[PDB]
Amino acid sequence: TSQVRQNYHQDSEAAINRQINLELYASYVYLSMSYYFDRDDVALKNFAKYFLHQSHEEREHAEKLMKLQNQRGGRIFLQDIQKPDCDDWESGLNAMECALHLEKNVNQSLLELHKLATDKNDPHLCDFIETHYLNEQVKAIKELGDHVTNLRKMGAPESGLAEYLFDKHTLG
Amino acid sequence: TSQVRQNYHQDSEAAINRQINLELYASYVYLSMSYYFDRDDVALKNFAKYFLHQSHEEREHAEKLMKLQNQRGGRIFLQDIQKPDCDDWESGLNAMECALHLEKNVNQSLLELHKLATDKNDPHLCDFIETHYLNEQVKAIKELGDHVTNLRKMGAPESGLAEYLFDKHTLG
Amino acid sequence: TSQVRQNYHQDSEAAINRQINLELYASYVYLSMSYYFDRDDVALKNFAKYFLHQSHEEREHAEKLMKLQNQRGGRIFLQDIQKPDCDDWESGLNAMECALHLEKNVNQSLLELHKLATDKNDPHLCDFIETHYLNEQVKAIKELGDHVTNLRKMGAPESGLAEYLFDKHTLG
Amino acid sequence: TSQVRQNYHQDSEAAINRQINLELYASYVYLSMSYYFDRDDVALKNFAKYFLHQSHEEREHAEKLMKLQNQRGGRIFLQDIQKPDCDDWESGLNAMECALHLEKNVNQSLLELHKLATDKNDPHLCDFIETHYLNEQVKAIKELGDHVTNLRKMGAPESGLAEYLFDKHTLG
Amino acid sequence: TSQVRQNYHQDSEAAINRQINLELYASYVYLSMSYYFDRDDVALKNFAKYFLHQSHEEREHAEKLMKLQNQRGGRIFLQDIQKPDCDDWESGLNAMECALHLEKNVNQSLLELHKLATDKNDPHLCDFIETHYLNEQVKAIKELGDHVTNLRKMGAPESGLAEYLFDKHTLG
Amino acid sequence: TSQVRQNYHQDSEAAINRQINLELYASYVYLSMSYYFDRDDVALKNFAKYFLHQSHEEREHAEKLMKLQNQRGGRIFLQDIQKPDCDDWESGLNAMECALHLEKNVNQSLLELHKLATDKNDPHLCDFIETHYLNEQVKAIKELGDHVTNLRKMGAPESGLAEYLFDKHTLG
């Protein structure tokens, strides 16, 4: 047992490992989206740039948790990264939609994490999730919801002209 | 079939995809290595920083291949990222050795790739592999072989004073 | 025979001359395309600038081979520059398409030039074509394919509003 | 018929096309002369630079006429660029003499163009040739006439020393 | 056997040591020539300065192969440096001529080395020679040929005036 | 016989030629030592840097003598540079010691040279050697003697930890 562990539960340590692997998967999803728009038969250079940033930040969110797990005395245990369920992301609107579906599932895992931290009376882990992740998620779900609303009103995905300008005017 | 595909064989398009999953695997490995030294019961901050840089650079190498795939008209087909075969990396010298075994296996995959490109008479992919990857790998195999030599001559891993100073004096 | 000629085959010298005229022909073609868009009934200024640039760059590639011919001790023999097959390039999407066909035709010549050097065992003329032309050719083809995909997806050439905005947002 | 054409004759539109192709020919000859002095058995770097600049300026003159054609409502119709009559330019003097022979033939075609616009009562095309070309030619013919005088008096082409110092002291 | 050696053949390690000893021999030749022109009865400071630089660059070429050998796991085995075949370099034209004859013999050794790396399926050793040495030689052979041509047409070595202006106007 | 030779004895001239080949030998020796530590199984980058600078300096003293020889009307006659007696330099202490034995051998030669000049009554050759070589040698002998004392007292060569720190703290 670690010398720095204090009021850090076995259930809290296991759940963070599972969350580490979740962030890492989310990064592998955004990277998969990012370079689909890089294709010659897609060619939307600001969609590809938008999703390449999101994948870099999921990388960091996973790196912050593996700092936390070491900070409290727990032990990191990694798992396979499952590939994204899709290889072809259809369009820019379908891509923004599935990302919105991806950030709500990570939110749920986080609200369930914060929830275990309360049952365990772990207020630091409580305030660590509150500070670095919770508000960051709602800001992301709102941002994606704004992008999805803009594309649908502009005529996406049936109107190819609409996705072109949104790549230039909103993501540019 | 793509409109920009020219002199780009199906066997070359399949091998790049596998190589993408190989580099991403290597990135996940360094991420596992980097944060093992972040643990409170290991605590070598410049080993942890060393392998976190390598993971970002393998991330970027895989990102450079997905660009090429789209450049030549190919189609990216991703796969699961298998976890590293180890959760505990023992010591600092056992970590530099396992990265030296890693880079020589990726080098092999790049030579076999540079072969197939010669056989399919694809001298661009040949010159792509030569320019961005082959010499980068030899520079990495040589740098890891330099550290393992220094660590062993200092008394690693049995002497805890050795990996401390090497952390400070070479990796710092 | 020149004093500096070493390991430079007669067939290699002839094919370099044939590659010089082919570069100058492509320069002429981009010169035709450019001022077609300068016409008062076409009036797409950025399409006319984008193709002016590509003409000078073919002018510069042709000069780089003329420098090479004098380096290895060869002799430059010039030939007529045939006029481009078309005097009217229809639209902006037709023009981009014709450029994609052109650049793939030059690449084929460059790949057939690399094979001849490989047979002749001319490893410098090999690494010359590898370094200065092959990667450049793949980068131009990909860019003309990105454009054709965008113009097509915006409704070109049937929608005049699409070519206008692509003149402004992408090429501007 | 164009919407901008006004007081622009069919005989003047055709004559500008024939002038475009003559400038472009004068560009191909200076390019031909340029890299003849790049040859290892010639090796006169300032001659090669001198004639390379002349090649670019002919290129730019033909551009300006292609601009003019589109400005007045005409239509550009390109022809083959016939190769230079010589592949070997003998000496630095013979290259200056033949360049002087070239500019007077182009001058003749320009006066003949000026002349045709007069009978057409096309005063804008008259002043265009006057302002951009006619005085440019006379300065070029005179400077070319100055170099042929100097080279002849120094002892060219029978004294190779003479062509070397001119290449270093005048052209440098 | 070394811990970093991988796909590095015995014959290629032996050929590099023979190459190293050849580059160090070229350095001694340029150093010999350099201070010949420093002699009070020759007194060409810029010829002395030109060949001293070439002497420092051959040294650095030898240094880079000694770095390559250690990078790949091979070992450096050194041999005697044989003195130049000449102590008196006659004149400025005879020095540029024999330097030209030296660089084509070093060139051949490089092409025979690239030749060996390909039979062994060593693409890294291939591109290492390609990138650092092959194109550097062809430029040097062409430059030296340019000096040999310029000296001959000026009247060297029979005209002592000619070697003096070259010393000033080209090498200075 | 030279026009600028005055009070320069044939026995002095022959000795300078022998001293030139002795310095170049010393530069070759430091060239061997320096890339020994560059090896992946030695890997002391500062030991390698220390001896590379010593090789360039011995290269330079040999150039100052070649300048001297031409000044006094002497004629440089070069000889084969013998290879160093050893290809492997064992350790970092063994390399410092062998450098101390070399320098004292070069010193002995210079003292025998200063002597011979006094007997031929050449005070300028005396003051030359006095100024540029004698005081330099004693300083290098003392510096090398300081490095050998430190390494011995720190436990070299048996303690690999010693050679590493002295590589960092003294040579770094």
Short mmCIF file of C-alpha atoms in Angstrom, two decimals, chain A residues 2-4 20-21 24 27-28 31-32 35-41 45 52 55-56 59 62-64 66-68 70-84 86-87, chain B residues 2-4 21 24 27-28 30-32 35-36 38-41 45 51-52 55-56 59 62-64 66-68 70-84 86-87:
data_model
loop_
_atom_site.label_atom_id
_atom_site.label_comp_id
_atom_site.label_asym_id
_atom_site.label_seq_id
_atom_site.Cartn_x
_atom_site.Cartn_y
_atom_site.Cartn_z
CA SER A 2 1.15 3.52 -0.84
CA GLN A 3 2.62 5.98 1.66
CA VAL A 4 0.61 8.94 0.30
CA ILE A 20 -8.75 7.18 -18.24
CA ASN A 21 -9.49 4.57 -20.88
CA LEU A 24 -8.30 7.87 -24.52
CA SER A 27 -9.33 10.84 -28.56
CA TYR A 28 -9.18 7.90 -30.97
CA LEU A 31 -8.62 11.52 -34.69
CA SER A 32 -10.70 9.14 -36.83
CA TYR A 35 -8.54 12.66 -41.09
CA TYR A 36 -11.74 11.55 -42.81
CA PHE A 37 -12.28 15.21 -43.70
CA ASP A 38 -8.65 15.30 -44.89
CA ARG A 39 -9.64 12.97 -47.74
CA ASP A 40 -9.42 14.09 -51.36
CA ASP A 41 -13.09 13.18 -51.87
CA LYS A 45 -9.63 21.57 -44.04
CA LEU A 52 -7.63 17.30 -34.56
CA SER A 55 -8.42 14.69 -30.09
CA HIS A 56 -5.41 16.52 -28.62
CA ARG A 59 -5.26 13.17 -24.89
CA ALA A 62 -6.52 11.42 -20.04
CA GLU A 63 -3.04 12.62 -19.05
CA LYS A 64 -4.47 14.70 -16.20
CA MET A 66 -3.08 9.53 -14.76
CA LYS A 67 -1.49 12.39 -12.83
CA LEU A 68 -4.38 12.29 -10.35
CA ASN A 70 -0.58 8.82 -8.93
CA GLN A 71 -1.27 11.85 -6.73
CA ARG A 72 -3.52 9.95 -4.30
CA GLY A 73 -1.66 6.63 -3.99
CA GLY A 74 -3.53 4.54 -6.54
CA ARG A 75 -2.04 2.44 -9.31
CA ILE A 76 -2.62 3.01 -13.02
CA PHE A 77 -4.01 0.01 -14.92
CA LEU A 78 -4.47 0.51 -18.65
CA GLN A 79 -6.74 -1.26 -21.10
CA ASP A 80 -7.03 -1.73 -24.84
CA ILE A 81 -8.24 1.24 -26.88
CA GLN A 82 -11.20 0.08 -28.91
CA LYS A 83 -11.31 1.46 -32.43
CA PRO A 84 -14.18 3.80 -33.36
CA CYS A 86 -17.15 3.69 -37.84
CA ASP A 87 -14.54 4.21 -40.54
CA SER B 2 -10.35 7.84 -56.09
CA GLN B 3 -9.63 10.49 -58.70
CA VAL B 4 -6.10 11.24 -57.41
CA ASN B 21 -2.01 1.20 -36.06
CA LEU B 24 -0.41 4.61 -32.54
CA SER B 27 2.41 6.08 -28.73
CA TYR B 28 0.15 4.32 -26.22
CA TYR B 30 5.25 5.57 -24.21
CA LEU B 31 2.19 7.04 -22.49
CA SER B 32 2.16 3.95 -20.28
CA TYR B 35 3.30 8.03 -16.12
CA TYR B 36 4.79 4.97 -14.39
CA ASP B 38 5.12 9.80 -12.25
CA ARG B 39 4.12 7.44 -9.42
CA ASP B 40 4.88 8.54 -5.87
CA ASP B 41 6.83 5.29 -5.33
CA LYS B 45 10.27 13.51 -13.24
CA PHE B 51 8.62 9.25 -22.53
CA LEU B 52 5.72 11.71 -22.70
CA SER B 55 4.39 9.46 -27.14
CA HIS B 56 3.51 12.84 -28.65
CA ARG B 59 1.17 10.38 -32.24
CA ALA B 62 0.84 8.20 -37.21
CA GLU B 63 -0.72 11.57 -38.10
CA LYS B 64 1.79 11.95 -40.93
CA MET B 66 -2.91 9.28 -42.41
CA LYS B 67 -2.13 12.42 -44.41
CA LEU B 68 -0.17 10.39 -46.97
CA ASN B 70 -5.40 10.58 -48.23
CA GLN B 71 -2.80 12.23 -50.49
CA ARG B 72 -2.46 9.15 -52.72
CA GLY B 73 -6.18 8.32 -52.94
CA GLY B 74 -6.13 5.48 -50.42
CA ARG B 75 -8.71 4.88 -47.70
CA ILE B 76 -7.82 4.82 -44.00
CA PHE B 77 -9.01 1.71 -42.13
CA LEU B 78 -8.28 1.95 -38.41
CA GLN B 79 -8.04 -0.85 -35.87
CA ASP B 80 -8.09 -1.30 -32.12
CA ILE B 81 -5.06 -0.02 -30.21
CA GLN B 82 -3.93 -2.95 -28.08
CA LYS B 83 -2.77 -2.11 -24.58
CA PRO B 84 0.94 -2.45 -23.78
CA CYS B 86 2.93 -4.45 -19.17
CA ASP B 87 1.44 -2.20 -16.50
#
